[PDB]
């Protein structure tokens, strides 16, 4: 396994909107993509550069209660300090009695868990989130990544007009990671493209018998991911994402998904 | 695979009832059920026989953006007009880069995207939904097929009192297709009979994972299907389907799967 | 199979709360977790001690309309009366037509269908629930069990400072089965412990796809399980389990699950 050792900081980008950087002045809602490959631990400084009381807390990843990110466990930062995280990892390992250890891979998130309650309300309200992809060997790996999060009515914590453009060219293959927060449910929806309901998108064997769906429910701390191949049998052109839940849909949960030419020119048709 | 090329009407049935029908004056809500193998090709003419401005879409099938039925890529259909739709699909195949390409075998639907706002909210509110089923080639067949569609508080747009009865005869091979629409989350359930939850609702091979459920999520735009044989284990008789949300089947969302004698006679105890 | 005999007390436990027992005076809720192997038969006295009209109806298991527990078809128990209810189960086989049967195993339920409503929307709402556990030969057991229910905004019906505190010694083969009821939406949450999204939260052979999650839905009338490793790979202490929906946590839906160490004793840091 690979230790990496990172700082990451949590900011006040403007009014209402806090998130994660991995540079002084560079926190993005949602934050950075975080990727690891089973095995591998990541050390993570959390400098706290805000007013407020927060943490960092992840999903699936090996951590001990000292890194767990809560009030309870001493695990939070205060404002202008720092908190060193441990996140472990693992491949999978045979136990003694003779059952299986699943390796940790799959796509994770992480989030605040301290911010304004116990459960981070405030500061997931805000945008302290990002995902944490944890590897296989063997795994295919994306041209594009793009991270979709359903944060109560809001996608990616934009505007209701402003939800993302993410872009892509035809052929290429494009990584979703998609997660829920707040207290709305939600179910994500992608024109044009499908995937295998699986860990990765994809058939893993002649045996795996997962369906192919376009839809999936994505609700409050629910994280999945997936790949496909941007326009694949459908060609270029501006294709929705939205929540399929209609009044949701209607208030602006909606995006595009722009594929453009393999050459990376806009489609005639747009 | 197979081309087949039809005409759909869309219809205003009655007073906030819209559906799609085969023939003029033959609109139902759920639509027809419509069936492709991969890697068939359908070419449906949709007749607008409305006043209103509406479409037709897919989940799951290959179709490209002037097939989408939505407003933004100028495919909807205007009052009195006609629009071909053109849905492929495609049996699995081998990537370049070795992964593979899954087939488009599943449960999937179709409904209104135009009519009342870019998502189809009113034409989905009012009836223009039906299922769309792609079968993988070797997979069992039913004798009975029932389309089950929570939208919002509905079953099939039936009044209150008027959820559907669904019937079969003892021993027979019942295929059930559930889709939820609208604005509200559901859970589909169904007494005495069970599937497995993957593709088909039955085990693929000895190696098949998947649990064995009688309750699954049904939330807006989602679909899934199965099979089952009707009083297997658990004998004739009046058998509940219905939503699990305690309010949603005190108001109504309950119907009866009406198993009855082999011989098509009414079991004694109804 | 093994046929076993046994008598459910249908009880009120103090104001606003009923449940089933297994003993005069030994009702609990959640009740008592019936066990059963593919193949067994269960038959149910259920001796209805209360003044109110009210049931027992499982999921999962093969049982006829005689046995269905709802008031339609003859199934509930008058106050003071007792009702046989015979719940039968099977392992896999294969039809005539090819297709394989699938055997019961799963982590089912059973609750009450008569009281208040034909949906038992009254009996559920005040404590008349349980875990039905049907297992495969060969399944490993558990040394812990736990049944967490998610019934409208409360855990097992507690108050909401009083949520269920689960305890484990490190290194304990945990079982955990989850069951929602009610109204309202949910998501089940564990910290620093994972699982495999299948029958058993375990791989069943090399080419099991299913992902691995730290969370699920639990919506009414869904239920799953697994089992865990207490600790493992993120040592003791005191770790929350929740629901994830925030409005949700924060009024109380959140507990702890206490893994002390291996001998028994309390972590230093608790
Ligand atoms: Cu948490
Ligand atoms: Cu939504
Ligand atoms: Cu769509
Ligand atoms: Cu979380
Ligand atoms: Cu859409
Ligand atoms: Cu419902
Ligand atoms: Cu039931
Ligand atoms: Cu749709
Ligand atoms: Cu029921
Ligand atoms: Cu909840
Ligand atoms: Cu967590
Ligand atoms: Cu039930
Ligand atoms: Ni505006
Ligand atoms: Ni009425
Ligand atoms: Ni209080």
Redesign the pocket.
């Known amino acids: 396994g690979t230790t990496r050792r990172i700082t990451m900081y949590a900011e006040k980008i403007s009014d209402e909107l806090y998130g994660y950087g991995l540079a002084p002045g560079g926190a993005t809602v949602p934050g950075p993509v975080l990727e690891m490959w089973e095995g591998d631990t990541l050390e993570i400084d959390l400098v706290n550069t805000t007013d407020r009381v927060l943490s960092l ?1 992840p999903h699936g990843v090996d951590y001990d209660v000292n890194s767990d990110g ?1 009030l309870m466990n001493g695990s939070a930062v205060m404002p202008g300090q720092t908190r060193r995280y441990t996140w472990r990892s693992h491949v999978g390992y045979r136990r003694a009695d003779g059952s299986w250890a699943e390796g940790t891979a799959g796509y994770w998130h992480y989030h605040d ?1 301290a911010m304004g309650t116990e ?2 309300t405030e500061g997931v309200l805000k945008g302290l989130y990002g995902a944490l992809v944890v590897r296989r060997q063997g795994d295919l790996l994306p041209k594009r990544q793009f991270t979709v999060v359903f944060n109560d009515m809001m996608i990616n914590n934009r505007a209701h007009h402003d939800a993302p453009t993410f872009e892509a060219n035809l052929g290429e293959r494009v990584e979703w990671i998609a997660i829920g927060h707040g207290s709305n449910f939600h179910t994500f929806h992608l024109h044009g493209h499908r995937w295998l309901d699986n860990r990765t998108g994809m058939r893993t064997s002649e045996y795996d018998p997962s369906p192919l769906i376009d839809i999936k429910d994505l609700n409050p ?1 629910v994280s999945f991911g997936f790949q496909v191949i941007a326009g694949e049998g459908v060609g270029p052109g501006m294709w929705m994402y939205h929540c399929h839940v209609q009044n949701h849909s209607d208030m602006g949960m909606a995006g595009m998904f722009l594929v453009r030419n393999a050459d990376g020119t806009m489609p005639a048709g747009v």
């Open positions: 807390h809560t868990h459960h981070g701390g």
